[PDB]
Design an enzyme around this catalytic site. Structure first.
Site, PDB file in Angstrom:
ATOM      1  N   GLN A   1     -60.139  45.603  16.798  1.00 32.02           N
ATOM      2  CA  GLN A   1     -60.225  44.343  17.530  1.00 32.02           C
ATOM      3  C   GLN A   1     -59.584  44.463  18.908  1.00 32.02           C
ATOM      4  OE1 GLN A   1     -58.264  42.503  14.384  1.00 32.02           O
ATOM      5  NE2 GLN A   1     -60.010  41.290  13.657  1.00 32.02           N
TER       6      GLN A   1
ATOM      7  N   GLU B   1     -67.957  36.112  19.105  1.00 26.51           N
ATOM      8  CA  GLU B   1     -66.726  35.819  18.384  1.00 26.51           C
ATOM      9  C   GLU B   1     -65.644  36.779  18.841  1.00 26.51           C
ATOM     10  OE1 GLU B   1     -69.129  36.901  14.829  1.00 26.51           O
ATOM     11  OE2 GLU B   1     -68.438  35.049  13.874  1.00 26.51           O
TER      12      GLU B   1
ATOM     13  N   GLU C   1     -58.572  45.332   0.894  1.00 27.38           N
ATOM     14  CA  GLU C   1     -57.772  46.547   0.760  1.00 27.38           C
ATOM     15  C   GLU C   1     -56.525  46.516   1.636  1.00 27.38           C
ATOM     16  OE1 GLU C   1     -60.898  46.152   1.833  1.00 27.38           O
ATOM     17  OE2 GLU C   1     -61.492  47.698   3.243  1.00 27.38           O
TER      18      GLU C   1
ATOM     19  N   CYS D   1     -60.629  31.845  10.663  1.00 28.08           N
ATOM     20  CA  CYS D   1     -62.021  31.414  10.595  1.00 28.08           C
ATOM     21  C   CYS D   1     -62.263  30.152  11.422  1.00 28.08           C
ATOM     22  CB  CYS D   1     -62.436  31.200   9.127  1.00 28.08           C
ATOM     23  SG  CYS D   1     -61.603  29.843   8.228  1.00 28.08           S
TER      24      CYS D   1
ATOM     25  N   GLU E   1     -68.352  32.039   2.802  1.00 25.07           N
ATOM     26  CA  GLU E   1     -67.571  31.441   3.888  1.00 25.07           C
ATOM     27  C   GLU E   1     -67.428  32.502   4.969  1.00 25.07           C
ATOM     28  OE1 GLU E   1     -66.488  28.357   4.204  1.00 25.07           O
ATOM     29  OE2 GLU E   1     -66.701  27.545   2.160  1.00 25.07           O
TER      30      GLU E   1
ATOM     31  N   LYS F   1     -61.281  40.621  -6.150  1.00 25.10           N
ATOM     32  CA  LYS F   1     -60.986  41.765  -5.281  1.00 25.10           C
ATOM     33  C   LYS F   1     -60.401  41.275  -3.963  1.00 25.10           C
ATOM     34  CE  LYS F   1     -62.854  44.098  -2.067  1.00 25.10           C
ATOM     35  NZ  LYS F   1     -61.725  44.672  -1.295  1.00 25.10           N
TER      36      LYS F   1
ATOM     37  N   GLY G   1     -65.280  36.338   4.463  1.00 21.65           N
ATOM     38  CA  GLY G   1     -65.229  37.488   5.348  1.00 21.65           C
ATOM     39  C   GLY G   1     -66.307  37.406   6.426  1.00 21.65           C
ATOM     40  N   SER G   2     -66.716  38.583   6.884  1.00 26.38           N
ATOM     41  CA  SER G   2     -67.588  38.702   8.038  1.00 26.38           C
ATOM     42  C   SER G   2     -69.025  38.348   7.669  1.00 26.38           C
ATOM     43  CB  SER G   2     -67.516  40.115   8.618  1.00 26.38           C
ATOM     44  OG  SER G   2     -67.841  41.101   7.661  1.00 26.38           O
ATOM     45  N   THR G   3     -69.753  37.834   8.658  1.00 24.89           N
ATOM     46  CA  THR G   3     -71.141  37.463   8.425  1.00 24.89           C
ATOM     47  C   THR G   3     -71.946  38.652   7.912  1.00 24.89           C
ATOM     48  OG1 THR G   3     -71.225  35.573   9.892  1.00 24.89           O
ATOM     49  CG2 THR G   3     -73.240  36.847   9.640  1.00 24.89           C
ATOM     50  N   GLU G   4     -71.722  39.822   8.505  1.00 30.14           N
ATOM     51  CA  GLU G   4     -72.456  41.031   8.167  1.00 30.14           C
ATOM     52  C   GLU G   4     -72.196  41.463   6.724  1.00 30.14           C
ATOM     53  OE1 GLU G   4     -70.395  39.838  10.903  1.00 30.14           O
ATOM     54  OE2 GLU G   4     -69.975  41.723  11.971  1.00 30.14           O
ATOM     55  N   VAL G   5     -70.927  41.524   6.310  1.00 26.27           N
ATOM     56  CA  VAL G   5     -70.686  41.836   4.902  1.00 26.27           C
ATOM     57  C   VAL G   5     -71.178  40.712   3.980  1.00 26.27           C
ATOM     58  CG1 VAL G   5     -68.939  42.320   3.201  1.00 26.27           C
ATOM     59  CG2 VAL G   5     -68.827  43.427   5.461  1.00 26.27           C
ATOM     60  N   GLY G   6     -71.109  39.449   4.421  1.00 26.53           N
ATOM     61  CA  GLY G   6     -71.687  38.376   3.629  1.00 26.53           C
ATOM     62  C   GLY G   6     -73.176  38.569   3.379  1.00 26.53           C
TER      63      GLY G   6
END
Ligand SMILES: NC(=O)c1ccc[n+]([C@@H]2O[C@H](COP(=O)([O-])OP(=O)(O)OC[C@H]3O[C@@H](n4cnc5c(N)ncnc54)[C@H](O)[C@@H]3O)[C@@H](O)[C@H]2O)c1
Ligand SMILES: NC(=O)c1ccc[n+]([C@@H]2O[C@H](COP(=O)([O-])OP(=O)(O)OC[C@H]3O[C@@H](n4cnc5c(N)ncnc54)[C@H](O)[C@@H]3O)[C@@H](O)[C@H]2O)c1
Lengths: 481, 478
Positions: free
Chosen positions: B336, B381, B182, B289, B255, B179, B232-237
């Protein structure tokens, strides 16, 4: 007499912060052994901070050279060897397993694993990596940091040592939660750890319960790595807590629905002897236990008959008696679950070949039980029994038995009994199991990795592979002017 | 003027409309116009692709039957094709992300080829162990393929982050469901065509475009996915790893982001340290990153480092990604931009000194001096063009301050001194430590996070540990 009952932080013994204590009981006498300090999150925090201090750069433990971490691990093994009789007795009091089994199996495993990993301390080696003409690139396998260990009640000392040995040889420090049912040997190990001369705070031990001490370890923001042995459901929770907190690295050693496959050309008496031990060892309360004994139809009836004999002759009783091969079940909870599964066996149409009830009431002993005529969708074929129940299924073809053996969500171990070279190796590669035994059972080595496919675990313990759970890869990349 | 040929779901080397019929638009972030529409997958389409990947992984399938070295030949074939259609791939990456075409061509696509070729050569060198035990026992390990692998990747380096997953996963013999983000689906879809033209059997790689909470969540909780790799992002990880554990305990590589420090010692080559720290902060509008978020400079070269940094920042060209001169294209998203300007203002209000920049034209390259640890621009960040420059006195001090983060992806050290270089490399809690360089990646060198910057490693031999399952075979002889 039980000497060590307190919380072990910085090579000191501590009352719990709440003052609360919990009882540990002898399953064989049904009487209470002693009371152990009941830790909680404040005690975990005091332990983690200790482990952090002992891990800071420049601490004594971080300053030791590699071989001295080895030497300390040998010193630990030496003391465990000296007090073997006493550790095996405490394991027997807590678990109900026969004394001679705790002495020759559990304690022997503990000593071997520690000596094995002692010799890994100065051979943990990273890589120098060719890149460009003007670049020096290499990797370091550094200690991961503060490691939590959460262990179950069936092999209390051994499951902890499988964690302590690789973690310390890699230079980590530790917080240990033994199972609330079986705290006694962990606490004893702690005195030996201070005697071995490990610096204070390298190993800390907080007894208590799962949702209190355990969950506080798996959610702690300054624990970097957790190793868990126990049920699949609690392991999911532990990895979830690890992920919601600080993304600590997780090793999971979980349950299995372990198949045991007897081909028509097996040495039948060896297969019967090994399948019997694999089902019934340690009162059936073993992560490696055989839950499905597949027997090819050409030897099905004779396998069953010979298995019933072994089961009717296995001595059950006082674990401190030379003759006992089967002690009591661990507690009333498990005792009831096994008897319910036995009843489902009868109710679902399996043929009861022997046993199938309590042994004499008053005690937590269960008669060794064999079922034949067992099919895949029966409950005794689908659920971990953790009891002395041998369900024997029938199969026709290798291809069929590979499919039925793999159609589980689990994959810890499997065993194959055949004299045919192609069959053995075709099954070894096709069975989705972390360990495939061939013409043996429960053959474990400190130098051979152990762990599950699928929902039987993440990561490995034992062998060189245990080191990967306990180290963090760092790339250093230097460009020359 | 490049037409988009591939906009569909890729299952069994066939192109599929979405089960729902729903589609989503992908837009050029520089022209702001809509490029095309892409099939929007959801849980039904994931299920279809996971079933394809299992049929492809079944014992006896063409893919499982290939000899180890043919898996390597197929990866090399996929590199030849990517190399052939390099300009077309880089263009699609430019349309989708806004980064400069030359950057896509000589960075992203170059890393794609190198990574594919590198892991092609691993396919027949994935070796287990024979293990000495007893006199009558034969004990060995097999490094087996894990099975069906999901790959979920972000918008900033779309193709490259897919390929960091696809290359080791295929070479170990897994099958995959991919995936892409998007916002950036175009190069993933085009790679699927080259996967078919290279001759991978159908079902070995499947691609479902769509959104995070729909497609990505169906992947991470899928009962028949064995392994997931996420960038991707820490939160979605954190969500992905929790969904993985809640469903079937699938293995998970992460990662994630980082608060990546630079450390400039007094004896550094200062012009080197300035050039590298500048590239680290400002490359790709800061949306990388590996971007540097804290620049620690020893007090003896502090003011001179700041001066040269301000001059270096005022000359970097910003503009159209299809022009030869551009080194900085537009940013992807509105969110951002706004928070960058809020962080800029917190910097002023908390006592930092603004040396240059500090407003929109997307955003002027900005340098802060007199930054301290407890300030916001030193703690969050930024993922934009903001260079916070902190001062330090001792090596021991800057070790503590560099490591007092929950992250640890990379770090860079600048010093001519052997002892300083090596003390800092050992002491820093970072998955990569660059000495006297920046953004020096190699397909043969592992990359990945300490602490909350990740789980596992990508690239190098270590990548293969994420895509194999260790089996122990123990044979007792009579
Ligand atoms: N969820 C429970 O705590 C619970 C409750 C009742 C019965 N059981 C069942 O009883 C048996 C216990 O045997 P076992 O010791 O092999 O299984 P287990 O997985 O319950 O226990 C293993 C270890 O994990 C710890 N633990 C328990 N809950 C925890 C949590 N939420 N977070 C962190 N650590 C936790 C325990 O204290 C013990 O040290 C299993 O069959 C289990 O499912 C479990
Ligand atoms: C938002 O978030 C962006 C962050 O950028 P990024 O792409 O690097 O970070 P991200 O972590 O939001 O996305 C990375 C990838 O994860 C997917 N994803 C998102 N939520 C998910 C979920 N709940 N489960 C599974 N997969 C999920 C995304 O669709 C994408 O493919 C900003 O640019 C802005 O657009």
């Amino acid at each position: 007499e039980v000497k060590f009952t307190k919380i072990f932080i910085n090579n000191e013994w501590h009352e719990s912060k709440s003052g609360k204590k919990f009882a540990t009981c002898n399953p064989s006498t049904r009487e209470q052994i002693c009371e152990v300090e009941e830790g909680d999150k404040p005690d975990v925090d005091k332990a983690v901070e200790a482990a952090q201090v002992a891990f800071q750069r420049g601490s004594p433990w971080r300053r030791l050279d590699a071989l001295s971490r080895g030497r300390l691990l040998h010193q630990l093994a030496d003391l465990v060897e000296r007090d073997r009789a006493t550790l095996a007795a405490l394991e027997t009091m807590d678990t109900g397993k026969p004394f001679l089994h705790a002495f020759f199996i559990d304690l022997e495993g503990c000593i071997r694993t520690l000596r094995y990993f002692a010799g890994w301390a100065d051979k943990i080696q990273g890589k120098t990596i060719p890149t460009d003409d003007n670049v020096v690139c290499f990797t370091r396998h550094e200690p991961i940091g503060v490691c939590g260990a959460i262990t179950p009640w069936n092999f209390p000392l051994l499951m902890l040592v499988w964690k302590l040995a690789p973690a310390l040889c890699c230079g980590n420090t530790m917080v240990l939660k033994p199972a609330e049912q079986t705290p006694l040997t962990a606490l004893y190990l702690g005195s030996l750890i201070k005697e071995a001369g490990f610096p204070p705070g390298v190993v800390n031990i907080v007894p208590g319960f799962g949702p209190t001490v355990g969950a506080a370890i798996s959610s702690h923001p300054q624990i970097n790595k957790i190793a868990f042995t126990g049920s699949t459901e609690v392991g999911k929770l532990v990895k979830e807590a690890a992920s919601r907190s600080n993304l600590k690295r997780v090793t999971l050693e979980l349950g299995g629905k372990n198949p045991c496959i007897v081909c028509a050309d097996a040495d039948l008496d060896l297969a019967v002897e090994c399948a019997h031990q694999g089902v019934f060892f340690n009162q059936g309360q073993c992560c490696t236990a055989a839950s499905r004994v597949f027997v090819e139809e050409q030897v099905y009836s004779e396998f069953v008959r010979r298995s019933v004999e072994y089961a009717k002759k296995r001595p059950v009783g006082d674990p401190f008696d030379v003759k006992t091969e089967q002690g009591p079940q661990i507690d009333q909870k498990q005792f009831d679950k096994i008897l319910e599964l036995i009843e489902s066996g009868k109710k679902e149409g399996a043929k009861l070949e022997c046993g199938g009830s309590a042994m004499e009431d008053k005690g937590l002993f269960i008669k060794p039980t064999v079922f034949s005529e067992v099919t895949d969708n029966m409950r005794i074929a689908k659920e971990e029994i953790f009891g002395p129940v041998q369900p024997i299924l029938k199969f026709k073809s290798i291809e069929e038995v590979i499919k039925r053996a793999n159609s589980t969500d689990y994959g810890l171990t499997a065993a194959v009994f055949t004299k045919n070279l192609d069959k053995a190796l075709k099954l070894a590669s096709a069975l989705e199991s972390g360990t495939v035994w061939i013409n043996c059972y429960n053959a474990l080595y400190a130098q051979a990795p152990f762990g599950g496919f699928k929902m039987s675990g993440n990561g490995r313990e034992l062998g060189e592979y245990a080191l990967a759970e306990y180290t963090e890869v760092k790339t250093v990349t230097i460009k020359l002017g």
